[PDB]
Ligand binder design. Structure first.
Ligand SMILES: *[C@@H]1O[C@H](CO)[C@@H](O[C@@H]2O[C@H](CO)[C@@H](O[C@@H]3O[C@H](CO[C@H]4O[C@H](CO)[C@@H](O)[C@H](O)[C@@H]4O)[C@@H](O)[C@H](O[C@@H]4O[C@H](CO)[C@@H](O)[C@H](O[C@@H]5O[C@H](CO)[C@@H](O)[C@H](O)[C@@H]5O)[C@@H]4O)[C@@H]3O)[C@H](O)[C@H]2NC(C)=O)[C@H](O)[C@H]1NC(C)=O
Ligand SMILES: *[C@@H]1O[C@H](CO)[C@@H](O[C@@H]2O[C@H](CO)[C@@H](O[C@@H]3O[C@H](CO[C@H]4O[C@H](CO)[C@@H](O)[C@H](O)[C@@H]4O)[C@@H](O)[C@H](O[C@@H]4O[C@H](CO)[C@@H](O)[C@H](O)[C@@H]4O)[C@@H]3O)[C@H](O)[C@H]2NC(C)=O)[C@H](O)[C@H]1NC(C)=O
Lengths: 668, 668
């Protein structure tokens, strides 16, 4: 069913050790392995478990003081917590070998705030080169409270308090059933009480567990606060990735907007009311998540300083552009080079690369952090360890808030204003001399919703006795967007046998009006679907390529239950190991219409130039010296896009079955 | 009534060809010369008709694509349109000789957007050194849709459709008359229905056709998007010219306010409502001109982005002022010099010189352009080629909108803030050793209204038959301000004998208070009347100087019909030839009162230093190394303006006959 990889026994021991810190994250089991190891791990007397004496002794300074206590909300966006998280990450990452890393994690798993631990631990598994290939459970299994709406969470809690079902038939009518002595709780996406506006049409994409997790993975693969020295040659292209990642996401999101009749992502002002509100159905130990009403005035007393910070952060960018020959933080940088694109993305992110340092420093203030605090609408932190959460406080929940897409669309618009200074590609740079795409055909592209399970066991609490047996079996089931596999068929005539790159993009055909888009106005609204190297023959030849093979999408994560079962076969899911940071397959297509929703497919073929071997942080970084998003990485002169080796096809996206997800969660 | 210039036969042949492109601008005569020459013109095979190969190929690339279609509105304020107009101007300007220039022009006149052609063609004639001396029809005869209120345009349109007057006597009552088999339509200035406020008191200046032409002329003489290197030594003074032009204009305009009981030009804020609306009676046969209501909020969603831009553009300037010295756009600028005045003007106009380049580039955004888009109130353009027009979209309608003077008042003030850095004139720099003005006498200064005709035939369509005879005779009659000629006599006692510069300025004597203006707060409010050099004798002499001779004012343009008759005699009008970019005489004085309105006449005599031997972009450039507006180019210490070689005279400006122009247009 799913791609597997054979895996050896030494691997199985280690993967098991890793996965085991993810069970009942909210409680300590006094008789699990990890607790004994933690009791036995003398942090004081193990300087020699670490590569780096400075990292170690830094941790100890903080530790002898004290860290964020257990059970409070952790967010990387508050300074003191970040600095604690980073100290923990350093320890994890400079652990001499796996056993030392294991012991430290056990230690932290017992003695530290669980959000803080989980955050550094994910990040550590991904970055340590001895853990590179190891698999993680999906964030929704690790943090189910950020992915379950309140309604469902309370239903789960009440079945635990009752220790099961009064009678099946009552519970069935509340969407609660038993399968194989496991509880299944049916969950709707939220109604207009949480999206009090049109943005509620889109709840099935914005609340999707895959899409939210996607963003979390993205953050974990290269956190803003860390340099990218780990990845060598890639360092010089970090800011490029930032733009590309957000341009792609907004392209995807606009496409969902279009199929639900919704139009452009709205623009705002720090000095004006923001139109579209959001009321999160989440809560922390102390606080329900902050709500932002409709027409929320951004410019109130408590935001005045933050807004002045944000306002000048943007205008500083404008001043660079006005000046052409800019220069922040050491060098003079020219706008027509690419040292430039690097700078641009880093600038908007305030990442560690901007300042050319290893880790972000306590006093270095982020644009994104301050925007997130203003848009999140929360009252100010009570003390440094206690803030009032909003959706924008976490990567697991950010994509739920319409303001998220508005903030990032603004940043993307600014970056695009810079792209006006880049030289557009000429005819000769885009022409594949001697080669011509003569036709493109596609299978029916069809979307539908179907059910989806995950274990939400991590936010139910369990007794001392039950913990001895690491208990799960509280499953949430959700209708989720999906599509049928299709094939793309490309017809090629060339003069000569050569290696080629084939790329595919999906973009809109018509605006909200019903007018055709021009390339000049639409290049930013295409997202990449696939990338691959093909060996062409001389003459007439034919390339077929299934959607299940598209380079940039993954299969669904498996639950840990399945992971252990596969592990017992020496098997592992390829997609969870080789590409967690990639968008889920089921969301590759925006919801269609029974009708057939008009979009367009761009197939581009250009020569393969042999670029040697790396090991970069995302699967978006493909073995090619070309810009990411190439040839749609910058403004376009439309007269150059009628190259024989390019082809635009109208495709229609259909939908099958029920149009509305709630029709799948109705009892009788 | 007008000054003539004898003119030879070669000239008349060339002048005629030139003027013939301005006939029936809006349709094509299949039997006219220009048409046959356009058809015979192989643009492809004639690269050698041009000085610049790059310019040639540049235009060709563009022309293979396609230009603004015929009939649509042309405005140089929209990027793609500007780039196309510039390409076509490059073609005109680099034409090897007059023949190639004519052909290109015929070609353009046939295959291109007429507005775009007229724009480019005007400028080309003014700029090409082999055309430097030739004359042009007044802007109101070439673009009468920009100088005719809608009521009049419709009266003409219906007379054409009717093929003349059904009944002379109905027609008469509507201000339509036959004269020498030509139609004369009487025109009122617009009522409170056009300026829904106090600014309607002034409609007779702001709608005036001379004043609007004047502004069109000033642009065409040196367009912001072009280099000034053609004028050599003048390039170092381009910003100085920019200031002076607006300062003079606003000073003249404020005088009209004072005589109509109106006070200071209101100040505004991008983040607040603008009090004074504008409703233009103009349409583009597609959209009517955009209206701006009273108390229109500038800061609404569609303007968020542009206001951000305008806001930093301003604040960047403040930061200059605060820093005294700084690098900007290559340069290191010190606000204590004059390389400063020039920079400051160039900054505010974002002209080509500010970047040290030949033409404005695609991506260098203009403050004035966005200021005008925001104040103009229009919905956003529909596409590249189709915007909704406002008065601020054209040089020929700009002066009609109250907001125009408010916008330039803002810029001029920012320059005055800079001018506080300039070191004030001292006794020794102003005192003319051994010379004294003992008296100034002035004839009665009297304003009045009288009728003025122009041919509006260009916004009337003709049949195939009529076109064969290039037809005109659709004349508009309008009361326009004017004054009676007068003499200034100056009495001078002097010790020795040199050439002197005599300068005359007009300033207000009191504010809207009734309180005497002091020079400290009035130097910006003087407009120059005259400049001339004089041989001074030892002892006592009298300089007599008539208004009809004032260096900065021109006679009225003759209509083409009259130009043609003069050409038939070997003559052209001097002022249309030697000085089209000068303000008309009739507007020399603001409307007085029967009473007599109190102003002051400033008379300055200083030593003449024989210098520059140049080639003039404007007549405002007189052969003197002194600043423009000297000694009122900068902050004054009032106690140095008491030199014997200065005289301030109180004058009173009278008015005669009807005070309101509408009484000139009443039927029986
Ligand atoms: C109702 O509301 C009130 C007020 O909000 C709230 O009171 C607060 O309770 C918390 C704990 O629940 C209090 O915090 C504790 O305070 C003591 C002593 O605090 C003072 O002394 C410190 C040093 O002497 C000084 O540095 C402080 O600034 C303060 O003045 C602390 O000792 C407590 O223990 C720490 O807690 C952390 C664990 O989460 C650790 O960082 C820390 O280190 C650890 O400790 C062990 C020893 O136990 C050590 O061996 C290890 O090395 C380990 O790292 C230590 O355990 C704790 O901070 C807080 O002060 C109260 N507020 C006020 C204003 O008095 C009530 O609890 C609320 N009630 C209810 C029912 O909700
Ligand atoms: C430019 O602007 C000016 C000012 O707005 C405008 O002048 C106005 O013109 C109209 C006609 O064109 C004129 O009124 C005509 O007025 C006369 C004069 O009437 C006088 O005497 C009346 C008593 O006998 C008295 O009641 C009036 O108040 C006034 O003092 C009048 O004879 C006409 O009568 C009517 O004729 C029309 C025909 O359409 C019939 O509908 C109606 O039944 C009457 O018989 C007519 O009203 C008006 O007075 C002028 N306004 C001012 C303020 O002086 C110009 O016409 C305009 N010019 C151009 C070329 O655009």
């Amino acid at each position: 069913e799913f791609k597997t990889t054979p895996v050896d026994a030494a691997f199985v021991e280690k993967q098991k050790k890793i996965l085991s810190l993810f069970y009942n994250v909210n409680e300590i089991s006094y008789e699990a392995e990890y607790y004994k190891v933690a009791q036995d791990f003398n942090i004081e007397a193990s300087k020699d478990c670490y590569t780096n004496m400075k990292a170690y002794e830094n941790f100890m300074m903080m530790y002898k003081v004290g860290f964020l206590p257990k059970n409070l909300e952790f967010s990387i966006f508050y300074e003191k917590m970040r600095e604690e998280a980073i100290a923990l990450f350093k320890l994890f990452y400079y652990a001499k070998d796996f056993e030392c890393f294991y012991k430290t994690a056990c230690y932290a798993r017992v003695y530290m705030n669980q959000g803080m631990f989980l955050y550094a631990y994910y990040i550590a598994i991904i970055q340590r080169s001895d853990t590179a290939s190891f698999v993680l459970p999906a964030p929704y299994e690790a943090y189910p409270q950020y992915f379950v709406n309140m309604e469902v969470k309370n239903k789960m809690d009440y079945v635990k308090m009752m220790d099961g079902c009064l009678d099946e038939k009552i519970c069935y009518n509340y969407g609660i059933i038993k399968e194989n002595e496991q509880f299944v709780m049916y969950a709707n996406y939220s109604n207009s009480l949480t999206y009090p506006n049109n943005e509620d049409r889109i709840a099935y994409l914005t609340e999707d567990v895959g899409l939210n997790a996607y963003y979390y993975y993205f953050h974990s693969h290269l956190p803003f606060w860390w340099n990218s020295g780990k990845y060598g040659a890639f360092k010089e292209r970090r800011g490029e990735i930032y733009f590309f990642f957000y341009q792609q996401l907004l392209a995807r999101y606009y496409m969902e907007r279009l199929t639900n009749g919704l139009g452009k992502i709205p623009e705002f002002s720090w000095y004006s009311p923001l139109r579209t509100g959001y009321l999160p159905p989440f809560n922390s130990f102390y606080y329900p998540f902050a709500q932002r009403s409709n027409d929320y005035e951004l410019h109130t007393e408590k935001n005045y300083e933050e807004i002045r910070f944000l306002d000048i952060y943007e205008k500083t960018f404008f001043q660079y552009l006005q000046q052409g020959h800019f220069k922040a933080f050491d060098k003079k940088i020219d706008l027509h080079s690419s040292k430039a694109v690097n700078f641009v993305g880093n600038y908007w992110q305030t990442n560690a690369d901007l300042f050319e340092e290893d880790f972000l420093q306590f006093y270095q203030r982020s644009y994104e952090v301050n925007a997130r605090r203003v848009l999140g609408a929360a009252p100010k932190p009570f003390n440094q360890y206690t803030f009032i959460p909003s959706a924008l406080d976490f990567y697991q929940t950010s994509a739920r808030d319409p303001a998220f897409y508005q903030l990032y669309k603004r940043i993307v618009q600014y970056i695009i204003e810079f792209k006006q200074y880049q030289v557009p590609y000429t005819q000769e740079a885009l022409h594949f001399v001697g080669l011509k795409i003569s036709d493109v055909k596609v299978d029916k592209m069809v979307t539908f919703f179907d059910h989806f399970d995950f274990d939400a066991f991590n936010t139910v609490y369990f007794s001392k006795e039950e913990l001895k047996s690491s208990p799960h079996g509280y499953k949430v089931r959700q209708p989720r967007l999906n599509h049928k596999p299709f094939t793309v068929t490309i017809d090629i005539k060339s003069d000569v046998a050569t290696n080629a790159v084939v790329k595919m993009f999906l973009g809109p055909k018509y605006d909200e009006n019903g007018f055709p888009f021009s390339l000049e106005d639409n290049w930013m609204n295409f997202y990449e679907l696939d990338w691959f190297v093909q060996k062409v023959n001389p003459g007439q030849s034919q390339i077929t390529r299934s959607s299940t093979d598209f380079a940039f999408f993954k299969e669904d994560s498996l639950p840990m239950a399945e992971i252990y079962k596969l592990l017992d076969q020496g098997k592992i899911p390829t997609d969870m190991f080789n590409s967690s940071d990639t968008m889920p397959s089921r969301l590759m297509l925006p919801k269609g219409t029974y009708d057939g929703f008009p979009f367009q497919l761009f197939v581009f073929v250009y020569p393969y130039e042999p670029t040697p071997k790396e090991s970069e942080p995302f699967k978006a970084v493909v073995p090619d010296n070309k810009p990411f998003g190439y040839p749609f990485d910058r403004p376009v002169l439309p007269q150059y896009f009628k190259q024989p080796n390019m082809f635009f096809k109208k495709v229609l996206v259909y939908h099958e079955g029920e149009l509305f997800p709630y029709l799948f969660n109705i009892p009788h």
